[PDB]
Amino acid sequence: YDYHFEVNGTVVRHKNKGFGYMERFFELKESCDERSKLSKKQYERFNALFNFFEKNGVICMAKDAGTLNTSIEINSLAYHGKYDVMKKFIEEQSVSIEDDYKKAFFLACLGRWEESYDLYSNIILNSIDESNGCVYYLSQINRYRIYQSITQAVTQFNGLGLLTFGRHYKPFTDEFLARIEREMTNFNIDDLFNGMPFEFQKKYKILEFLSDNQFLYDDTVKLFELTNKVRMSSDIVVLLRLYDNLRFLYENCLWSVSFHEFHQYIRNSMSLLIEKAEYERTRDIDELGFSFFGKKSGFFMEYYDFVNISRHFKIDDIKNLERSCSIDKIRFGEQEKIEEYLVGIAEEITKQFSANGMNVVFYTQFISEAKAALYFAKYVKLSEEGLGKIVKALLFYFPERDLDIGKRYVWLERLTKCNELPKSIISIIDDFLVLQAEKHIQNYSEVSSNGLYSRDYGALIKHFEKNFISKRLSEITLCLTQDKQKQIDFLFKLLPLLSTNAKSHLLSFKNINDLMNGIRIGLIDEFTPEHEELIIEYLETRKVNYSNDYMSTFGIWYFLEEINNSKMEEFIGMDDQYDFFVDPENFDYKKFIPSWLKNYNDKLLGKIAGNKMKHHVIEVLKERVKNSNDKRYLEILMNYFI
Amino acid sequence: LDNNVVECIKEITESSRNGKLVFFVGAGVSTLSDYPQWWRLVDKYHEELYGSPKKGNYSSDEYLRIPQIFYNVKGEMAFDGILKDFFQVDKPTNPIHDKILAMNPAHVITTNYDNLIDTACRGKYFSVISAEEDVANATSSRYLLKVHGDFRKGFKGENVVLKEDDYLNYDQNYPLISNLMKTIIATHTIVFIGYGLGDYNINMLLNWVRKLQKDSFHKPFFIRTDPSPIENETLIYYENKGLRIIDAASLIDSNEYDYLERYSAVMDLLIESQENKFITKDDEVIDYIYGKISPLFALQYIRKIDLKHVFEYDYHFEVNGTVVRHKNKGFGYMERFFELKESCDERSKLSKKQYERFNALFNFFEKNGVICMAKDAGTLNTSIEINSLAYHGKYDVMKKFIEEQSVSIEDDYKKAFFLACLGRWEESYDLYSNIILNSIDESNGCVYYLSQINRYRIYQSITQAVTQFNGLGLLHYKPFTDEFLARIEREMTNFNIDDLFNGMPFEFQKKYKILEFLSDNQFLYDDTVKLFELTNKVRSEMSEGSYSFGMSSDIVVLLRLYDNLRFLYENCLWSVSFHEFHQYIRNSMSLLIEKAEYERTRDIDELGFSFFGKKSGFFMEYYDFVNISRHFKIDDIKNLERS
Amino acid sequence: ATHDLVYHSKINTFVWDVEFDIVLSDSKELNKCYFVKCFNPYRINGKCDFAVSSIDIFSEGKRLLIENEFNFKITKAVHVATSKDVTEIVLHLSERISSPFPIVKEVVYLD
């Protein structure tokens, strides 16, 4: 406690009551005439200390401050996820014990926990001499952590989640589990530091907290400051402390980076930082000026922040970040390095799927990062080649058991929002849907969770490319027969993409139920007079009959100016919805209630917004908002009716 | 099993958990690894000296007389050559070595001259002492005391006690090692292994322990592994001489030529019983619960969460008052205790002292609000009540309470807290010093620790106030005696707060385990992480517009809040002074107010479920109001008014 | 126990832990089945465009093809987790709302 070392790279005297050795040292390093008064051994010791302080980013006192660069960089290969480099470095022969330690950490990071444990045991056995316990000690810690992880995996893997092939293959054998339990039957880590030689305890006092089960309590507690609503900056100090912690944990090859506590700390820090930035921006724009502040948030985030977000965030946390602190108004950083990261992770997932030699633990530890990365890749401008590679990896080589058709449709649609659709990805999507048609050949059925299917893809293509024609589907459907029905069903589900000849050919392959089924998916897009006559007959049958909601769709259809018939005025008398959708001028609005208002889509609400019953709906929305502060009612009022 | 054996096992386990176990490893353990015994060398010397062997004339003294004759006749080089020839082999370690190391002994004293017990430590660091100069360069605080001169320095015969003359001049040759052995034996708890009941070393040690006073030693344990079950008279005589004997025989039984199985059975029994707590009927359950609870009686109130630390993660404790089995494999004392609490009839099956201790435990659990388990939990109602005068804010009350003389040290501690919250920090420091000085007497020491922490806290408070509040708007009062500002400096200079708890009696570190968290910000992290997570969840429900018709999550937050405040105020602690606590309280209350405001308005509640019932509702009382007025700033109040 | 019940705002629906033994029209009796609703207001639909939320019905966890949507024959509701005939409340609540389907297992927010 002699000196306070502020995170920005400065020092200050705090409780030094003796000679100011820090000031003398920094004066000696500042000038050249200060040197040459010291012996050769002192000269080389000062040179080594200067090099160490340069590598550690310590500059000078706060009096001689001004424009501190504070540029961070981490040169640990495992951080950047260059897995091929770790794979090639593992097989290479190791020279010294430090290379063995780094190899053990790399093996642990790759899911080969067996070899990591054996290597740690061998390292502990070999090196016990000298005051280099700084390796030995750390080795023990890593080993213990690995063991903990191993047992946790077991009690999480063989206990639940039988969806994996077999009984999860039992990734670790039972004999090794018994040996693990035998070697660590009563190992206590809290007394590891005390038993080591007293000179080690004197020198390496700073490494004590590693043996504790919790060591991020101080930063997590200090995170409270960002919630201060009152009017260096605390964002700078918090972010720099986070970078310091990440650099220390990753550069020294410590396994404690793979625990839940660190992930929770990372998520809390990032979420609080983004919340503070957005709150400050919104308060400034509300108070200072509508566009004087520029309406752009000052929190720039870069490659390091993106990789941290990808690594340590789950899906729902990113969902919270986007719905509360929307990032579309946040500007990115260097897009090129982000593109390199994305192409690397896509290459990794492609290799993992293709080689078929998957490892369950690495599977679980990596696809979380993968899904986070692809989900967050929406906000980055990406070149055509990177887009093609990412789509190729995601559409085909992403395993079914984690990503289904519906969520893959989410990812792809979310990816191009700002990336557009050059010819390449339309070609690759056409290839994917052609392959899907091939696999439809039967006891086969697509599974989705969000109720979406492959047809959406074609619609999206038709949304972006109206004139595109898929020839391969035409070739498939020319040879198509009627023995197998599911394939032609998929063919009508992809009707617009086909050519006129294919459409005419399939038209030969197909009461009010038939018309309703065709119109639900939209095969008979037009309204032929025969269909209108069937409509009249069904309405007359209902009227002479006089409750599922099937006829209100017909009033909606007439409201869409798609039914050119004058007999809809004579079939009213039961439902207020039909009268409103056919004769709104004479309609009684006492029976009108806004429950159906939350069911129409953009086109219907836009059409009804400009139609002139507008005062009736405006007063209905007024009263509904007054009695209850429903988000949907106020939102629809603002976006459509104002 | 025999009751005395159970008692010995319990004492050995208790000593092992406290790091006060020392193993006296004999020569039979090294024999199990097929190490060449001494009698082989004796016979070889007999052969090389005379020319023929004879087993019949091999008494106890011959084992030392024959090598001495060989050394005195043939010389020294022949002795070293024979020793090198017969002791250069290397042998694998024993499972018994791993079993003894797995008990975590503080020191290991061995009379062997082998390397097996060393090469067995696997990843354990021991400072090996086998000579005279090695006791001065002890690099660590854990001793592997090879009493009889290991062969590390070489295979010469002058480095090990084998012949008779060396045994005669042992005290004159090895004073330091003998003194160290006797000190270790007097301090820690000794467990012998691999020794014959008639061996020379045991007899010498008994002769030495005879000279000691009748009391003032811990009777060493002797684990005997011999084919013949021991006799009653020999056992009683050796117990009278000062040993407690546990015999491997009469427990497992085997043939005459097998030795590994008996050692294995004894060590497996010890290791298995280490984690197990010997609980059979209700009396043991209540005794153990009282033993692990009673030190907490000094504090007025403790929060429910850190209870999970007292029981060593044996039972997850929820804020609402329910408990859930987490890492318990034994009798399940919580289940039986709850059954005893529910059923009045079974309370008559306990002895009077156990009945009184159970009554005290039940009262303590009722004050803490622990209700029952999760399955038996129905409609649980929790009241909020704090008995701190300073919390309510009737300053005349503790003014006229500090006016007069107190009656006990705890009363003085209350006076110190009241003075600290009354602004007279000088008198607060003076009376805290008076307390820590008037406390030379204590059966617990908790008051001493708490007073030291509070004194350091108020010291930092006055230092920060003096240093910062000088140009903040003061312009000068900063009123304190000039000598006082240097007295606090020189006095509270070397006093480090991180190592405070590490320097307290070994039982205090075992009983008041939770209080360590008071020395730092630790006592907030475990709760603030949950607060952040629940904040995120509640805001997600806020954004999606979902309405919950069951029980809301916010109650959990609320409970934690109140508990924290009570634990900080009923114990009269100055830690409520910092701004971290204020920020935490402010965040929790902002969350609660926002959630209540959102739950105030609904759409379908009236039409529909309203007939079934109505649980929704939120209310500010006295407590909420005082907390708002104390732990909030004006701008945040304006912000929440706007929101 | 109505803890499961979660009521939404943008769709005005219920989410329970129950299961339905629906009977289809024309005396077509069905086994246990359940509903799943997915809300998507940004769908770029075609000429047939009225609904924002897609409702799907699955029997035994398998997608059941829908041709005649005439399942106005009530059901016997069983609270899948605790297995209780919540059916009476099921009607109590379905007769009190205008939504065609009052209870779904969960609502998927694609928006």
Author numbering:
A (entry chain A): 336 to 566, 578 to 787, 789 to 857, 861 to 896, 909 to 974, 976 to 1005
B (entry chain B): 22 to 142, 145 to 498, 503 to 670
C (entry chain E): 10 to 120
Pull verbatim passages from the article behind this deposition.
The defense-associated sirtuin 2 (DSR2) effector, a SIR2 domain-containing protein, protects bacteria from phage infection by depleting NAD+, while an anti-DSR2 protein (DSR anti-defense 1, DSAD1) is employed by some phages to evade this host defense. DSR2 is arranged as a dimer of dimers, which is facilitated by the tetramerization of SIR2 domains. DSR2 has a two-domain architecture, with the CTD responsible for sensing the infection signal and SIR2 acting to prevent phage propagation.
We therefore reconstituted the DSR2-DSAD1 binary complex and determined the cryo-EM structures at resolutions of 3.4–3.6 Å. We modeled four DSR2 molecules and two DSAD1 molecules into the EM density. The tetrameric DSR2 displays an elongated shape, with two DSR2 dimers forming a head-to-head tetramer (the four molecules are termed A, B, A’, and B’, respectively). The second binding mode involves DSR2-A and DSR2-B’ molecules. However, these DSR2-DSAD1 trimeric subcomplexes in the two states are nearly identical. DSAD1 is trapped by the tip of the CTD fishhook. The H4 subdomain, along with the H3 subdomain from the adjacent molecule, brackets the β-hairpin of DSAD1. Notably, Tyr16 of DSAD1 stacks against Tyr574 and Phe576 from the adjacent H3 subdomain. The H4 subdomain moves outward by ~10 Å to accommodate DSAD1.
